[PDB]
Design a protein around this ligand. Structure first.
Ligand SMILES: [Cl-]
Ligand SMILES: [Cl-]
Ligand code: NA
Length: 129
């Protein structure tokens, strides 16, 4: 599924990300925009052989099982495929674990490089929330 901007902001709010670990809703929408262009089916192979999955590009190196990332962990206790669903539950629940683990949203490279320090409220501007 390719979410619209305000559509995703509303879904993310319903799924409990607004101000989760102190990160306002616009931080999460901005992260999704630059990680996946709001496409739940986005996958990208990293040069180490791990793959990033879903709207927040969660990496099989640590967070999910795809059966083809030797030596990796599955800290969210899910198949990576769960992260590709139209239903954002598994991505959201895993992201909540990630953002809680010490480094905050810096875990998302696109967030650090393209969202951090910017006017992230523009991403939810005008949305019915
Ligand atoms: Cl694996
Ligand atoms: Cl933080
Ligand atoms: Na893994």
């Amino acid at each position: 599924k390719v979410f619209g901007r305000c559509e995703l902001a509303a879904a993310m709010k319903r799924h409990g990300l607004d101000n989760y670990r102190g990160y306002s809703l616009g931080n999460w929408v901005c992260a999704a925009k630059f990680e996946s262009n709001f496409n739940t089916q986005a996958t990208n192979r990293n040069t180490d052989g791990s793959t990033d999955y879903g709207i927040l590009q969660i990496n099989s190196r640590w967070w999910c099982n795809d059966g083809r990332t030797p030596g990796s962990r599955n800290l969210c206790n899910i198949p990576c495929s769960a992260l590709l669903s139209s239903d954002i539950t598994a991505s959201v629940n895993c992201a909540k674990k990630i953002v809680s683990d010490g480094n905050g949203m810096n875990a998302w490279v696109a967030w650090r490089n393209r969202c951090k320090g910017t006017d992230v409220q523009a991403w939810i501007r005008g949305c019915r929330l």
